[PDB]
Amino acid sequence: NLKDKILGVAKELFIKNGYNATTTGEIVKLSESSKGNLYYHFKTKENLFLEILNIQESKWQEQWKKEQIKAKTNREKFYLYNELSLTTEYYYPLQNAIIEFYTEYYKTNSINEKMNKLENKYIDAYHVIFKEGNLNGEWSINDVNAVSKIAANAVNGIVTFTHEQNINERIKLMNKFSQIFLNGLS
């Protein structure tokens, strides 16, 4: 719980001041813990952050599990999962901390190892869709693993670098992408 409290407090601080501005001092002092207990649970700020990301990751996966009930077929799932990514990220509180963190340790192979396992989970979602799609003749894909990585990265770019138009138009583009990409399969 002292650990859970650290995670909880830390999260709010990152949300409030981004990754860089947040100090383990604050986290310690605000969660009424100690540098010693923090170091024992996470060693470094980098790591602490990574765990929070892991936890958020599971919340997302859990939200998806419930949200996909609105999408019957796998082609629909693809449409919905992308839509979701776009909208949720628009107002995700940690988004800012993530950017900071990401663009700081993406050069360091150390803090890039754990980051991979995390991203893979995110891709996994797609792997599932395309695979279940094969068992339903919605499409026939030779190597799911490749397409999955492609969709995941193409969708995120469309999400990250689109920042400029009204959310309404964004969805339209995102859905157009789904349409096209799903059509480039078959």
Ligand X SMILES: CN(C)c1ccc(C(=C2C=CC(=[N+](C)C)C=C2)c2ccccc2)cc1
Residue 92 interface partner, choices ligand X, a copy of itself, none, CB cut-off 5-8 Å depending on type: ligand X
Nearer to ligand X, 38 or 53 (CB): 53
**Interface with ligand X in residues 55-114 (CB under 6 A):** 60, 85, 88-89, 92, 98-99, 102
Nearer to a copy of itself, 40 or 90 (CB): 90
Q: Kindly state the tokens that stand for 178.
A: 């789904």
Can residue 90 be called a binding residue for a copy of itself (CB under 8 A)?
A: no
Which ranges of 22-94 would DSSP assign to H, the alpha helix? 24-31, 35-42, 45-67, 74-91
Q: How many CB atoms lie within 10 A of CB 97?
A: 25
d(CA 48, CA 35): 13
Half-sphere exposure for 56 (CA within 13 Å, toward CB) = 22
Can residue 152 be called a binding residue for ligand X (CB under 6 A)?
A: yes
Q: Give the chain's length.
A: 186
Name which of 129, 119, 116, 131 is nearest 64 in CA terms.
129
Nearer to ligand X, 34 or 103 (CB): 103
What residues make contact with a copy of itself under the rule CB under 8 A?
Answer: 18-21, 95-100, 102-104, 106, 109, 112, 116, 119, 143, 146-147, 149-150, 152-164, 172-173, 176-177, 179-185
What residues make contact with ligand X under the rule CB under 6 A?
Answer: 60, 85, 88-89, 92, 98-99, 102, 119, 122-123, 152-153, 156, 160-161
